[PDB]
Amino acid sequence: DPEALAAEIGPVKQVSLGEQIDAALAQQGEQLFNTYCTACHRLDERFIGPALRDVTKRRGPVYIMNVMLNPNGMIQRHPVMKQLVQEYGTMMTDMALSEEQARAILEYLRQVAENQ
Numbered sequence: 742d743p744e745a746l747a748a749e750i751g752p753v754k755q756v757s758l759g760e761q762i763d764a765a766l767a768q769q770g771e772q773l774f775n776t777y778c779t780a781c782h783r784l785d786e787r788f789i790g791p792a793l794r795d796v797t798k799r800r801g802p803v804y805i806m807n808v809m810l811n812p813n814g815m816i817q818r819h820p821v822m823k824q825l826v827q828e829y830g831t832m833m834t835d836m837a838l839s840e841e842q843a844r845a846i847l848e849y850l851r852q853v854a855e856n857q
């Protein structure tokens with residue numbers, strides 16, 4: 742169970758989502774994605790790392806939060822991230838992100854999956 746494994750690696754164990762996307766939180770997330778993530782990721786194609794538009798359809802939220810917050814631990818202990826390092830070659834590394842920043846980015850990722 743890859744989401745169970747992500748929760749065991751940490752740091753995040755659980756997330757709170759409302760019934761709908763919080764649009765202001767998603768906008769904050771967009772800005773933070775530009776700042777932290779666009780250097781290596783696109784929404785609709787591979788780049789330095791994988792395409793992200795549908796990551797919330799493919800992966801659980803605790804996985805996505807812990808890749809952002811603890812990419813080194815995820816690469817060391819989570820089989821999906823380890824396979825992606827074999828595929829992509831370069832590594833995602835610590836960005837000194839806080840949980841609230843990562844939760845905003847996750848909100849943005851939920852939004853772009855809806856935008857299609």
Ligand code: HEC
Pocket residue numbers: 774777778779780781782789790791796800805808809816821822825826827829830831832833834846
């Ligand atoms: C280049 C230096 C990176 C930065 C900046 C960010 N990511 Fe990344 N990410 C990168 C690669 C090369 C990979 C594959 C694994 C590896 O380390 O080689 C990834 C992977 C992800 C994943 C997993 C995707 C999956 O299909 O499971 C996610 C969810 C992810 N990256 C998210 C993400 C976000 C939100 C970023 C900004 C906070 C971010 N990454 C930065 C390379 C790079």
